[PDB]
Every structure is written in structure tokens, then in C-alpha cells.
Amino acid sequence: TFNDVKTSLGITESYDIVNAIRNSQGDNFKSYVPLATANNVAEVGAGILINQTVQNDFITSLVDRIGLVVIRQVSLNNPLKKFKKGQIPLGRTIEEIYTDITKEKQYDAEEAEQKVFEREMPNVKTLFHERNRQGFYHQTIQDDSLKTAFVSWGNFESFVSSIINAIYNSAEVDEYEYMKLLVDNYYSKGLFTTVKIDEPTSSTGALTEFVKKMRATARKLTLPQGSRDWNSMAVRTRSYMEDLHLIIDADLEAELDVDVLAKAFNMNRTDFLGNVTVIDGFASTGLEAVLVDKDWFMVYDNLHKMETVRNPRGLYWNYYYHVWQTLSVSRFANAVAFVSGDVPAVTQVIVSPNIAAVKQGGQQQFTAYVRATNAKDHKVVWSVEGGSTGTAITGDGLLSVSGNEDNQLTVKATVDIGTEDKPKLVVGEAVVSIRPNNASGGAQA
Amino acid sequence: TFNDVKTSLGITESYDIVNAIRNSQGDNFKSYVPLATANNVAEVGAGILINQTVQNDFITSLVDRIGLVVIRQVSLNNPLKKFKKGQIPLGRTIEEIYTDITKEKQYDAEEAEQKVFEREMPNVKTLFHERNRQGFYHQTIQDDSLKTAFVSWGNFESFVSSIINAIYNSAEVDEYEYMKLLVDNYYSKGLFTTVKIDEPTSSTGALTEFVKKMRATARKLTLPQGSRDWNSMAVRTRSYMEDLHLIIDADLEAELDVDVLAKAFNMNRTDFLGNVTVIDGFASTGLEAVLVDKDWFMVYDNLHKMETVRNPRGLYWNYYYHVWQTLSVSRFANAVAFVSGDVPAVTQVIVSPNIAAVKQGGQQQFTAYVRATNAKDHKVVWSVEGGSTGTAITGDGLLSVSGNEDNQLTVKATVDIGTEDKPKLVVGEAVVSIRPNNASGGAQA
Amino acid sequence: TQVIVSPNIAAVKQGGQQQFTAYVRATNAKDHKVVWSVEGGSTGTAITGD
Amino acid sequence: YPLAAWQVIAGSDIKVGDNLTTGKDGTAVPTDDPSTVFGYAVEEAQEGQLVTLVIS
């Protein structure tokens, strides 16, 4: 059902090889002058998009046939699938619970006469995950109308077996792409612990600097005493060298082994210390070479159903392949970003306990963890949003809730970056609900 | 729910059988007088189309009952089911290739000095039969509404199988009606070789003349040298006697038995040659009988599925019975029509090579066969239609081609039938591809 | 380098719709506009952006 | 099938919002004299191109 469609259809020729390029020349193309049939090789040698039916050269009533039919079969996969966690049939939310270390008290036998039964609570931080992805894939197969496209049931069944895999390849493509989105989501929110590097494309020396900061950071993570940076929740966590996964694209993997590793004599000294997963590349600006634990990913599966239906009077199957999955990342495992280019001086203020509850009249102590990307100092200004008449933080994060008050205080911790003409503020927030205090009684004297 | 419908619904009463018994005495209705209940048998004795509720004769409150349910299950067939060639599961198009005979040349002996390697292509004609009928059938079985209509499961189930048979019998009947259509198509297109003879059911000798022309034409088909006179492609083909099939209608069968085969001391010397199938009759006007080979019919099956579906909401089953089949006719096989009325003088102009591919500037010989009845000395007026100047054909058919043609040609062979006031033109046609040459002389002298 | 319309062979019923899309090979990594234009048609047949 | 808008071949150049009336061969042309107005164009069209506008 088509007309006289030309061969050079969707082709803008950067130069015509058919004309004076191979005809009128005293240059490079002189080796194609002795070819005789070269015009037709130049015409349809790239392939023909539409098969016009060609008569036989000798007996024009006959029709030339299709000799060989090739069915190209592709198999796509997910490199990031090795970071998945399992299946969640029931429920939606994932409660993640980390119990952190506490503070020492001094021994005193005399104060221990009255401070038995005293209370010191744990330092628990919680984090919450949720099903994000629920989409489906739809592929229709009309069985019976495809049989006119075929001889040879081997090629008919291989083509039908290919359309089902194209529903299965569309899951591998998207789940790689969603798990790549978890890196760029978590970098746009400033939650990575960024490390400023110079650009490794530019020189071999700035690459040699870059290799050190990977081997240094990977040592710092695996220190047995732990570290209260390198995560966004700012708790102390050790990591393991067999669990640190580097996610580095092939542009940066090619500059490494050509410059650093080949010219080195001791490859296990400038190596990258762990597991280098090779990504196609990040989508942000300047983000290179993410270093994360394997527990940083929290990817679970909710359902994998191939639900079908059949239209009788159409004689086709509709394949509905549903994928529902929980795609989120931890803030307890360590996550280091290696960023070239302009960074903020301070990317993140983290406030100790993110949530708190305190009786009206009580008090609460805070700690502003500053993720400054450089050896610099930054004084923190504390603040109370929603306070009124007595609720005030006294500097250094000691909230003193007054009394009379229940309207859910908000505690800010600001680091000012820059000039007074551009006072750039990096604010970390905590929310405080107020439990009432009936031990007082209104008036006092 | 119906109101007062009489038991005479569409009844056209030839006479009152009640009064012809009651009044008239001495005639043939006198034997119905000693019948006691003849007025009641005469009333509802033909069946009633609409059931009036009839009360009981002893107690008027009760109603009379439907005691017996009789389900007619008529199965039908296809009388032409023997003509089918099989099944094509894969592919769409069927190609028939016929290699015709060639023309003799005189022994040259001095023109062969330059013609040793001159080449002459065979007369290979071809034909392409593609899939035509792509249909389905359709029934609703709203069985929950049907359970009120029956009081037994033996009659509920025999009626449900009765609707399934109507799906299959409709396939049987319509496959017959397409295979009659292929005869009336081929006759309307004038591809049947008309044997022109007045009606067999008009007189006794016109019945015998038919039988003399039947066994003559069946002999002329099977001659071991063949003939061009009975195709629509005019190739020398040869029929065999066991493969000839005669498709007379039902009156023409009974005229053979009673009028010539009864009086036949030697019935083998009177009856029809070849196999004789008996059909209801051809739709076309005047077409009395059709004599074809077994190869004239090309009916292949492509699909026979039945798929069901259940509507849970309306509580019914759909029954879709799909029939896909290739319903085509081989133009290479001998087929003769016997036609009663006035026919035209020429029914078809057959043009030889008929798919040409000249060189641009070259020449092709075209010959035209003319189908005729009385025959005549008619004429053939050649032409050619394509937008070039140059490109003229002779009165002998030798098509000249311009050196700058670049358009597909359409060579005609027109025979005029009738007067110049209202001319009937029977036109045989061809096509010509041009195959551009490379003379590169733009302006000769 | 090259622009690629992704439904290469298409078949549309008269009075129907079809959604075409275009891939643009470009070395410069610059944003490039794709100018949709239908041809060979009559009065009535028109294409929009995307 | 009460249409709220039509596609009519422009008998001239038509601007968006122009009131339209019948022209040569039944084509749509710009007007200015209420009585001749049958519709208002919603898109610009050149002579020979269809223009789609609301009736009113």
C-alpha cells in the first residue's frame, strides 16, 4: 500500500558521494574510480526503508523474492539491579530506625543516692520511605494478522518472542533510569556530602589530585570509630570497604586507566578502593563519581504482574505488564559527592534532633552540623519561628520554651554565605511540638 | 405481549374449507362430512405462529399447557467443498506461473550470422491470488433470559446447541455463496468463453442441441494438443476428462434423465461428460451452465477460529467465528460458460506480453487476441497512453518508445462493437516500465 | 548530523491521527528546534508541534 | 451535528479575530458589515488555506 517513495528519504547528505566527489576528482576518492557498480552501492547501500516490489530482470512477469529474514534480538539489563532489596507485598511505608551513641556521666557516689531512677533517653533518628513508582507497560499482539508477514514458523515465533521481551526490556531501561534519578534527586536537594574537586578532564595533574580524595574519603568512611559527617542525618556510622560502591561514568573511567593506572607501576595503590560501577553518566552539572554504601539504596518491589486480556472479534492480546516499586535512598549510609565547578561554600546545615517534644517551661539542646566544603569557619545564628513572648534560643542551640505556649515552634540554624549585598542563607530546620504543663497553675508568686 | 391476533396471520385463503365442506354436497368434499370434528381440525391445523393462551375445556380457570418442545436441528453443507485446494497458514499471496508455448521461426541460415547470442525470453505469464474474504460470524447467547422460555434442561441445552449450529451453517452457506460469486464475477468481467445457445427448458430439440454442444465442448477441451480458445489468458492449455466439472442447475438435471437418458439404449453415449454437480443456479442473466477444471477454483483456508467472551454485566456469551480465506479463480485453466440470451460479439481482448519492460528508446511487439462468438473480421485499434511526445505504436502493435519517456505507459487494444452512434469498446490493456538509458546526446543532427 | 522521525513508515486512516517524534543527532550539544511540516497533501491536512 | 466552529477555505488573507463572510466561490473572506458576518476566525490564514473560527 505505497507509492514511488525515493531511496534518499530521511537522509540529508553531508556530501553527495555519487556525483563529482567520486567523478570529478584528483584527490582521496581516486580509489573508488575503478569500481564499476559503485553508483548502486552508493544509492541503496545504506539500506532501503520501504520495499518496492521489483520485477525480474529477465522475465518481467515474475517477482523477485525475499531470501533471508533476520530478526535482531536485543537483551537489555540493569547494572544497578544489584542494589535492590526485595519485595514488599503489604503496606506502603518503610520505617528506618538508627540508634545513635550517647554521652558519658561522671561517677559520683554521693549524687547517686538521689539520682537512681533518673532518665536518659536514647538518640534515635527515624527516616521514612514510600512507594513512588507505579506505572505499566502496554504491548498489543495481533497474532493472526502477523502471519501474512511470514513464512517459516521459526521466524514467526521468534518475532512474537521478541515483542514480549520488549516489554521486559522496558522495565530494565526504566529501573536503571529511576535509580539514576535517585542520585540526581539527592544531589539537587543538597543531601550528598559534597567534596569540591578540580575538573579531571582538564589536566593529568588535577586527575592525580582526584584519585587521592577518593582513596582518602574511602579510608575515612571505613574508620572503626565512625564519623558523624558523610551522611545527611548526621549520625555516626562506620562503613565497610567491601560495601563502598563507586558510580563513575565511562568518560572518567577512561581518563583514569589511560593516565593514572597504566603509567603507575603499583596499580593497587592508585586504584579506586572498592567497587566501580560504570554508569552512562549523571544528569546534573558537575556531579562526578558518587561514592555510596550499598545500604544507601532502598529499592524494593511491590508488584510484577503480567496481566493480559483478549479481544475476540479483533483476535489480539493486550499485554499489561505492571511494575510498582518503592524507590528511595537512605540518609544513614554514607554518600559522598565529587563535584567539579562552582559549589556553595556551605551546602547543608543539619540540626540535631530534627523533631523534638518538650513540656512548656522545659528546654532542649540542639547541634548545627555544618557541611562546609572547605576548611572554613561558620558561626550559626539560631532562631525560633512560631515563638511568642518567652520562647527563645539563647545562642548555641539551647531552646528554652517558656510556658503559655502551644503553637509548634520551628528552630532554624542559619549560615550566611557571602557579602551583605547578597546574604546567602543556608537554613536547617527542626520542628518542636509542645506538650502542656499542668504542674504550674497560671498565676504564681 | 400480543393482543388479539387471529390464527390467520398472513393467510391468503384460496377458498373456505369450512364452507366447501358445509355447503357443497355431491362434489369431492363430501368425504369430509362424516367427520365429527372437522371444523376444529380445519381451524388450527396448519400450525399457529402466535400462541393465544387457550383455557381448559373442563375448568375455565386453568390454562392449557405446552407439553412438547421439538427442536429442529438442520445441518447444511457446502456442495462445492471438494473444490478447495487446502490451507495457507502463513503468507498472503499465491502466485501461479504458467510457461506458455513459443512461436516457430523459419530456418534462417544467413541471418543467423549475427544472431547466435540473440536472446528471446519465454512467454511466462503469471497471476497473483491474495486473501479476499476476511470475515466473522456473531451470536449472543443471553442464556439467563432464555431460561424462562424452557422448562427442561434437555430442551434448554438442545436449543443452545441449535444456535451454535447456525454459526456453523452460516459458514457453510456463505462459503457456497462466495464460490458462486466467483462464477458471476468471472462472467460479468467477460472472462468466460461464451458458448451461445438457446434455452434447454424451452423445447425438446433445444434440450438435445445443448447435450450435443456439451459433449462437443467437453471433447474440445481435452484434445491432446490443447487450445488457446478456452482460457482468459489465451495460453495453450489442456484439460483432462476426469478433472472437468459441470455445474448445471437443477432443472437441467431432470431434463437429461426424463427426456434423453430414459430413451437411451446407450446412456453413456448420451449423458454429460465429466463430473456433474448440481447447484441452485447462477445469479447472472442467461448463464445456463459452467464447465470448469478442478484447477479453475483456488479456494484456500487461512483461518477458522471461534472465540467466546462473557459479559458479566449483561449475562451473555458472544460467539465470534472468524473465517479468513483466499477466494480466487485461476485464469490459466479452461472454463466455458453456456449462455442463453443475446451476448455481445466480443467479450474480451487479450493482450500478449501484458507486462512489458522496454529500454527507453526501444521497441516491444504487442499482439492481441480477440474473443468472439460469430467470430468476425473485426479490427484491432492499438494506442498507448503516457504523457510523452514520441511513443507511438504501429497498427501491428510494435510500440515505439521515446528517448526521454520517464512515464509508465498503458498500451491499449480497442475493438469497437456496434455502430459509431453508440459504440461499445472492448479494451485489452498492458503496462510498460521504461528503464532509463544513457545516450547523453541532447541535440542530434 | 541527522534528524530521525521515529514512525518512519506510517499508515493513517482518512480523517485520523498520528503522533510523530524526532531524534536530533547533534555534536555541539546545543538545544535545537524541530520544525514539523507535512507535504504532498490537500487543503485540510496539517501538523502541529510534537 | 451542531458545530461550534468550521474549517473554511480562505478567499483572502485572514487575521485572527477577523469577522468573516462569504466570498467568491463560497470562500471565507474578511468583512466589516454585521449582517454579512457568520463567524469569527481564531487563526491566521493565507488565501487558499483553511481557517478555523467560531460561528456566532
Side-chain angles (χ1 to χ4, degrees), chain A residues 297-312:
Chain A
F297 272 140
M298 287 181 72
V299 174
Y300 293 91
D301 295 332
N302 284 113
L303 51 92
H304 286 277
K305 283 189 181 177
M306 186 70 78
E307 295 290 326
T308 64
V309 79
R310 183 161 177 85
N311 188 348

Side-chain angles (χ1 to χ4, degrees), chain A residues 60-61 144 147-148 150 310 312, chain B residues 91 124 126 305 307 322 355:
Chain A
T60 70
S61 64
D144 298 331
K147 290 186 181 181
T148 70
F150 275 132
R310 183 161 177 85
Chain B
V124 181
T126 188
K305 287 182 181 179
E307 296 185 356
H322 294 84
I355 292 172

Side-chain angles (χ1 to χ4, degrees), chain A residues 55-63 65 142-154 156 310-316, chain B residues 89-92 95 97 119-122 124-126 128 131 134 136 138 303 305 307-309 320 322 324 353 355-357 435:
Chain A
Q55 307 302 324
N56 192 5
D57 293 330
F58 177 57
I59 296 167
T60 70
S61 64
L62 293 181
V63 168
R65 300 283 302 278
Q142 294 191 2
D143 290 331
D144 298 331
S145 69
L146 287 178
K147 290 186 181 181
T148 70
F150 275 132
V151 303
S152 173
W153 297 98
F156 173 75
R310 183 161 177 85
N311 188 348
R313 63 180 286 157
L315 300 168
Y316 51 87
Chain B
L90 295 169
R92 181 168 174 169
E95 178 176 0
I97 297 159
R119 61 187 185 91
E120 285 180 349
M121 61 182 289
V124 181
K125 296 181 179 179
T126 188
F128 296 90
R131 177 185 68 188
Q134 201 176 9
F136 68 100
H138 185 193
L303 183 74
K305 287 182 181 179
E307 296 185 356
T308 81
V309 75
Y320 300 101
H322 294 84
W324 300 3
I355 292 172
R435 297 175 65 196

Side-chain angles (χ1 to χ4, degrees), chain A residues 320-338:
Chain A
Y320 297 98
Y321 174 60
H322 296 273
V323 178
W324 297 7
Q325 57 184 358
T326 298
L327 283 157
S328 178
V329 289
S330 179
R331 301 183 188 176
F332 285 135
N334 310 320
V336 189
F338 289 146

Side-chain angles (χ1 to χ4, degrees), chain A residues 69-375:
Chain A
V69 168
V70 183
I71 304 164
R72 302 292 180 183
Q73 180 74 45
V74 75
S75 177
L76 302 181
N77 199 357
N78 193 1
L80 295 169
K81 185 185 286 184
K82 64 186 179 182
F83 291 156
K84 287 172 64 172
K85 289 291 183 181
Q87 298 179 359
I88 297 175
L90 293 172
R92 183 176 183 175
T93 310
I94 305 159
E95 176 174 1
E96 195 175 3
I97 298 170
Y98 195 93
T99 299
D100 202 1
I101 67 171
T102 182
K103 188 178 179 180
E104 194 173 2
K105 293 181 181 180
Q106 294 187 1
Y107 176 79
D108 193 358
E110 183 67 27
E111 288 184 356
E113 294 183 358
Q114 292 295 321
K115 290 183 181 179
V116 195
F117 304 133
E118 190 187 0
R119 297 167 67 244
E120 183 67 32
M121 63 178 288
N123 297 317
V124 177
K125 289 188 179 183
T126 56
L127 192 63
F128 286 127
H129 301 284
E130 190 181 3
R131 176 183 59 191
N132 312 319
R133 183 187 184 184
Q134 49 177 356
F136 61 92
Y137 297 137
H138 180 204
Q139 280 282 311
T140 294
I141 298 176
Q142 294 191 2
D143 290 331
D144 298 331
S145 69
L146 287 178
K147 290 186 181 181
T148 70
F150 275 132
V151 303
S152 173
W153 297 98
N155 292 322
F156 173 75
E157 294 293 328
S158 300
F159 177 71
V160 172
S161 297
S162 177
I163 298 169
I164 301 300
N165 291 320
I167 313 164
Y168 283 148
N169 285 323
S170 297
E172 304 288 325
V173 173
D174 290 334
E175 196 182 10
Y176 174 76
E177 196 71 31
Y178 279 105
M179 290 183 75
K180 193 172 75 175
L181 182 59
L182 290 178
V183 183
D184 296 326
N185 190 15
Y186 197 81
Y187 176 74
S188 63
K189 296 187 188 297
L191 292 165
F192 275 147
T193 299
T194 60
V195 169
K196 180 175 180 180
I197 63 170
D198 301 331
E199 180 173 357
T201 307
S202 63
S203 73
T204 67
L207 177 59
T208 310
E209 295 291 327
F210 172 61
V211 178
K212 301 190 287 186
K213 296 174 185 175
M214 303 171 80
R215 295 188 65 90
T217 303
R219 178 64 69 193
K220 290 183 179 180
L221 294 178
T222 62
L223 293 180
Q225 74 274 22
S227 184
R228 302 176 67 86
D229 49 348
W230 309 112
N231 52 358
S232 298
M233 292 297 282
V235 292
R236 181 176 286 263
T237 301
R238 66 176 295 171
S239 176
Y240 289 88
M241 188 58 72
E242 66 266 16
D243 297 333
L244 290 174
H245 296 282
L246 274 169
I247 299 168
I248 299 163
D249 56 350
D251 281 327
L252 181 57
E253 192 190 11
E255 295 176 356
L256 174 71
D257 55 355
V258 173
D259 294 335
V260 175
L261 292 175
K263 299 175 181 178
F265 187 74
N266 298 322
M267 293 175 68
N268 51 358
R269 296 291 190 181
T270 48
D271 200 359
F272 276 176
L273 284 171
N275 304 319
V276 178
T277 305
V278 186
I279 196 167
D280 57 351
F282 289 134
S284 180
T285 301
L287 174 62
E288 300 173 356
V290 174
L291 174 63
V292 285
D293 288 326
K294 69 180 182 180
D295 288 332
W296 181 68
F297 272 140
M298 287 181 72
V299 174
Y300 293 91
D301 295 332
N302 284 113
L303 51 92
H304 286 277
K305 283 189 181 177
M306 186 70 78
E307 295 290 326
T308 64
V309 79
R310 183 161 177 85
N311 188 348
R313 63 180 286 157
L315 300 168
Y316 51 87
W317 294 98
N318 287 331
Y319 293 90
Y320 297 98
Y321 174 60
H322 296 273
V323 178
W324 297 7
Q325 57 184 358
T326 298
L327 283 157
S328 178
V329 289
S330 179
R331 301 183 188 176
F332 285 135
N334 310 320
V336 189
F338 289 146
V339 181
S340 65
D342 290 331
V343 299
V346 176
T347 64
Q348 186 71 40
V349 177
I350 300 159
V351 186
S352 72
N354 294 318
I355 58 172
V358 54
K359 288 184 183 178
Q360 53 186 1
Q363 67 187 1
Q364 184 71 41
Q365 176 68 48
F366 293 136
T367 302
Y369 295 88
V370 174
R371 294 288 180 267
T373 67
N374 48 7

Side-chain angles (χ1 to χ4, degrees), chain A residues 1-2 9-12 49-50, chain C residues 1-4 8-11:
Chain A
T1 60
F2 276 103
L9 183 68
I11 289 167
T12 296
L49 192 63
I50 297 169
Chain C
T1 302
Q2 184 69 40
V3 185
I4 296 170
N8 281 311
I9 299 168

Side-chain angles (χ1 to χ4, degrees), chain B residues 2 5 8 23 42 47 95 141 172 175 255-256 267 273 293 311 322 334 346 368 403 415 437:
Chain B
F2 286 160
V5 178
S8 168
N23 296 324
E95 178 176 0
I141 303 301
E172 291 290 330
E175 281 177 357
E255 294 287 327
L256 189 71
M267 290 187 282
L273 285 172
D293 290 332
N311 185 347
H322 294 84
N334 285 319
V346 170
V415 178
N437 63 354

